[model samples]
Target: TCPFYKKIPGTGFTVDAFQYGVVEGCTAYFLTHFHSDHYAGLSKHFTFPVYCSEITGNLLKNKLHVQEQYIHPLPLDTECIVNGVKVVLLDANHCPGAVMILFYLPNGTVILHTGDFRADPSMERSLLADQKVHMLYLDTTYCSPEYTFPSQQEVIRFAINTAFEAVTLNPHALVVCGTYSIGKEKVFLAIADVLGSKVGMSQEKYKTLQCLNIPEINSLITTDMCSSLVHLLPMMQINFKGLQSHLKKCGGKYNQILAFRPTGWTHSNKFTRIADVIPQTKGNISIYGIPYSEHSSYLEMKRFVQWLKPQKIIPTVNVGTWKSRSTMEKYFREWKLEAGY
Candidate 1:
């Protein structure tokens, strides 16, 4: 993270190395996650020594095809000196590859920067941020009260259940699921347990599942058989309406056809245009809300804030700060009244 004017997205600018306009206040930077919001600048063509844990580096290179030259890989919690500033990488734990940045200035002032960290951040990020801080630039994305989500494992389970149910409901229908080929292969493997095609998971996903010691559901889905018609397609499959329309026209010839993908879309006017192509006019269509989400729950977030007890905090997103403040103030008053403070 760059300490520039409200942060302009990247630290490649040699001039931004100076503080504000007068002093090159920003000397070093850190990336907290592999998600686009954090790593977009990496692909946006900023060439700098971005430090990350071994896990983060492996995932970035394996998932995004990033090269070693741009990243100065470091393990989680391992301390390294960037010029004169001492840096430590902590786990943000939002996804497979996430890290929080800690900078200990030579003057004894400590700055903590979280990159899109979750409500229930990794134990390390929580402990380190709460342990000590002179300046904390947090990953306050879910700082507000209303922004709640289920755990990542819960969502993965939901995806698996949906995949299993999809196969059960339409045994002969083609099952086309969409995800980033390298980025989200775990979802595919999870679903494989239900399809009896467990062995079909990519070698990489297989390795990951093994690392996590996730039990094999034994769906037995193998790419070896074309008639089975289970595929983990890329986002490009449905990125455009024209493609969906064409797929629909071709699919109509078949007795049964289906598609599934995890998305944050809601039933609103926002999706009107795209909704037209995949209108679920048939009563056969079903909508399932399996606790499938990638973010943290409200309780988890509250626990994070409760631990930090920051005198000053910055919320990373916009969602009625006044309302959030009122709610949090009530909590604070309760906390204080209970302590007689």
Candidate 2:
């Protein structure tokens, strides 16, 4: 949990300009989402009126441990006032309960704070607000042309089939699959869809999957109301032998396993290095690097820049946001406008 802004000094940033720090000795706070950096620091450092959607509240209570004063859901794109600040909570489509906060000021300054968003159509349809956007704050996670993320469905298929292959090859071998909590439901769904049954739906994960609200997708899942499944984030321990004289006592699988590996770098790498990473390999564990990112890519941001046509664009989140190194200058020069950071 860190209460500092993304670009503040000593807070881990590329630009080190956004000094949006978590206020000290304040009785209130506003959260855009629970995505680690967003409200994580609050639970540990500050205790204030954390504003978010209902789903986000549930996640905060269930996933992250925060039992303190917090406001209820403000709804999507609806205008309201909280702690003397005007606010509009909108969905980011990054995760199940992910919400973006729109801070409106008395001086008519509207700040659109986007937590994390991508060009995912399904997510867009469900998470976006139906209002005129002004003074945009966007997520430029992959705001470069080099990132061509694979499709979500494609990744799901690849992961499922690869896991199936591993299990089929060694039925007795305990295979370990790993994924983050925010968006691992699809992996379970992919497993279920391939296996023709939903996982036993853990309390938190099932709540998240339920938030998807797709009848077609939901129809594929199954579970009894009284029990849970093996669906979880932690690795399960197993013993093949007893102590001293048994071969099954040690718990760990060395079998052919399908798993995901982190390839997103520290952003200090050169742009050409992006080509060497951020994409999936075609063999072995079949680690399917899905296109299910919460941030827009280079081309996606370019399209967004072309569409909204802001006077000057500002990027949030990590590096690789501009198309070219001179994206700002190039675009501004063509528009005959002064380049502003």
Candidate 3:
């Protein structure tokens, strides 16, 4: 319960979105982002105002349909006092409106919750980069040596190029890009702008990107067979139901279907390095997995540990995965890896 939920000296306890307790009893609950995994039990039934970024607050209202009074918007870099705790938000760089949280307690201890973030120098402005962190709750999604994917910018370029190249190769095929409901707006926008074609997606996703004020996305609700060749669907829907449903509706219009998945876990089980592209062909459907990660990689985590120098590290996602903290402790040695980043 220490990692998932814990108490502060003056303020109430901090709890992740997944764990459930009496909401009315909480002084405030911090939501890192709008990702489903982070907010498993959060819904219309939620009782209190959840502290999160403005964007996440909007998402909770529009997407999750939570009431306005229940969604408290936390501004980035500004210290907002709640009860007696000093709270500040930092850009997560994971997805749009995602943020890492820092809580300053009355006892002069700084607790950090890195709610799913990527390692970028821009975020170094946060006090956590300079101050002594007593405890660090990490997002160890790829906290293994096997995950050495390239920079997200590089991977975005690769994905954009790959999708366009596939279109050039197969003119009759309809290309579909797989992405999270909110994350990977770049992937959709890149394909849309490069191809100069309308990107088909759900009405909900279109509105979500619309709030970002960047229509270079070329997003539309109706999936037109005549005007649109590229379709964007949620990552989970990039399966037989997604393909067969569209194919069945189109009446065999598309000869081939290609789905591009941009993620770190795309090649998790295999020996992978930076900028690795693996393509699998099954029947008329072809799936290409590109190396892209929103969370810090194993190397980046090691570098962060050296910079923060926290007394203790609490692995947020499945602490038992590494068996023990000692196994993860061995990975973070002296600070020689900073030269490359």
Candidate 4:
């Protein structure tokens, strides 16, 4: 077994990112973002130091109680050296300060860890212009051909317009849009701009949003709940199990509660459209799940890999039964012979 994970002719060290559960090792650890999945088993009790974006480091310090000394912060597009490896952090565009890592080895090998990124035109152009990458660690979350998600700009436009229309149609309803704790501030800010009303959140959530320190978002968030203003609920908290009681708590003050869950899995299991009113219980409150994703769709992934054309592609996730390397190679081979690949 290789000490670092794999062996390349040019690389002297192994690199790991967005993974945990190691106790004894002389390996470099990188954190892409503060998502709970990537941060599993990470705590103050660790044997090695971890490197991540400044925003992620701040959350680890404030939320996870991870000591500042244990987490090294890396700014975007800045190069730093660790264990004789030259590393640079590139903006991932998945969330605020999420990053893609580039490692330059001594023997001229370049390894890229795409830490949960969506397709950004500028980012793609910059990466394409860079030197050849020997190995690419890919994020295949939506690698299946069926995972056809629209551009996030288009979806966010849909979300903002839909929220505006929902509020206009039902003036008495409290429109609740679902989002993660840190990401998706754009949708909320857009809603606040379109309709001149504060976006309400719980005191705890409001505190977290404050840490982001974005002026556009800071001006719109509030702890105080009002029937006139829209509210944001974390996606984990905006489920069917807790919603009936949630609406009950609001009482007769609000005539209805309209909800939106913006995600990419709109058509994963069932055929869905851009903005489909997903069927649930018929009540005073209605729910709609919109297709908004921060991850690249299969189509986007195909174009990206073709443009970059790394020597080898390593699947980051454990795909037990689904598509394998041959599947990816099939597309790569087809693109190699096609125009504008």
TM-score of each: 0.64, 0.62, 0.85, 0.86
- Among the numbered candidates, top lDDT falls to 3
Alpha-carbon shift of residue 103 in model 3 (angstroms): 1.5
Query: lDDT per residue, candidate 3, 33-105, as tens digits?
Result: 8888777777787876688888888887887778888788877888898776788898888888888888888
RMSD of every prediction: 7.4, 8.1, 3.6, 3.3
lDDT of 4 by residue, 115-221 (tens): 78886657666643668888888787777688787677777777778777877987666777787756766777777678788888787777677656476665677
Output the number of the TM-score-best candidate. 4
Q: Give the C-alpha miss distance for residue 54 in model 1, angstroms.
A: 3.5
Can you tell me which runs of candidate 3 are displaced by over 4 Å?
Answer: 1-10, 23-25, 127-130, 207-226, 236-245, 251-253, 266-278, 321-324, 332-341
The residue-level lDDT of candidate 3 at 59 comes to: 81
The TM-score obtained by model 4 is 0.86
Native-vs-model 2 lDDT? 0.48
Better-scoring candidate (TM-score), 1 or 2: 1
81 Cα displacement, candidate 2 (Å): 2.8
lDDT of 1 by residue, 1-341 (tens): 43332342233212112122322443444555555545543442445555666666665565555676776677666777776557777766556556667667676666566655555545644447455765555544444455544455765765666557666876755445565522444555566546755343244544443322134423344444343455544455633352344346434533443555655324431333321323232333322323233444445655665565555444444424688656555654554454443
lDDT of 3 at 102: 84
Question: How does candidate 1 fare on TM-score?
Answer: 0.64
Give candidate 2 misplaced runs (Cα > 4 Å).
1-28, 83-86, 120-132, 164-175, 197-256, 261-292, 319-341
Report the lDDT tens digits of candidate 2 across residue range 172-194.
32232344455545666666555
The 0-to-1 C-alpha lDDT of every candidate, in the order given, reads 0.50, 0.48, 0.71, 0.70
Error of 4 at 197 (Å): 2.1
lDDT for 113 in candidate 4 is 83
Q: Comparing 3 and 4 by lDDT, which wins?
A: 3
Error of 2 at 280 (Å): 11
Clash pairs, model 3 backbone? 49-70
